[PDB]
Ligand binder design. Structure first.
Ligand SMILES: CCCCCCCCCCCCCCCCCC(=O)OC[C@H](COP(=O)([O-])OCC(O)COP(=O)([O-])OC[C@@H](COC(=O)CCCCCCCCCCCCCCCCC)OC(=O)CCCCCCCCCCCCCCCCC)OC(=O)CCCCCCCCCCCCCCCCC
Ligand SMILES: CCCCCC(=O)OC[C@H](COP(=O)([O-])OCCN)OC(=O)CCCCC
Lengths: 75, 49
């Protein structure tokens, strides 16, 4: 295990904190929240979306072929 | 003003200012083991009471 007081070394760093009864738990939830969600999705969409679009195209083609491959031809 | 004080007085007076109140904390030095403020704040009441 590991304990507080034996983790690492830190110097010259100040932390200011406020009590949770002095502040609001939902401050600017929609005012600042939505623009941050847009930035987060914008920053990662190009890395996540393409492979799942690639899956979507294979999925529709493969079923479209199979769904009609067992249709009959005049010959 | 002192002789008035008995045990009932300190319990009433202390609870008025200490019990379930938000403290101000100040730390300086090797204070990695200084408890987090939420933990400090929970030390200002007893669930048994
Ligand atoms: C379900 C089973 C319930 C078991 C309850 C156990 C009660 C008990 O041990 O009494 C101690 C406890 C003493 O707390 P205290 O008076 O605030 O004094 C703190 C000590 O000085 C010591 O205070 P402390 O600062 O050293 O520690 C604070 C401690 C104080 O709280 C506890 O000690 C609770 C003990 C764990 C109970 C687990 C619940 C399940 O909080 C915790 O650490 C517990 C966090 C649990 C996280 C689990 C995440 C999952 O007394 C009670 O809370 C009894 C009231 C319970 C109501 C029962 C409903 C009927
Ligand atoms: C049947 C009743 C059981 C009571 C359990 C209990 O109160 O645990 C402690 C904390 C809140 O007390 P505190 O951390 O402020 O400490 C107060 C110090 N005076 O509560 C929780 O967050 C624990 C969650 C448990 C989930 C299993």
């Amino acid at each position: 295990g590991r304990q507080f007081g034996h983790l690492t070394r830190v110097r010259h760093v100040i932390t200011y904190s406020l009590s949770p009864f002095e502040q609001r738990a939902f401050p600017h939830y929609f005012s600042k929240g939505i623009p941050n969600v847009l930035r987060r999705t914008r920053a990662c969409i190009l890395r996540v979306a393409p492979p799942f679009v690639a899956f979507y195209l294979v999925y529709t083609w493969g079923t479209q072929e199979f769904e009609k491959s067992k249709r009959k031809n005049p010959a | 003003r002192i002789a008035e004080v008995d045990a009932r007085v300190v319990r009433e007076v202390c609870s008025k200012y200490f019990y379930d109140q938000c403290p101000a904390v100040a730390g300086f030095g090797p204070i990695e083991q200084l408890p987090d403020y939420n933990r400090i704040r929970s030390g200002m009441f007893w669930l048994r009471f």
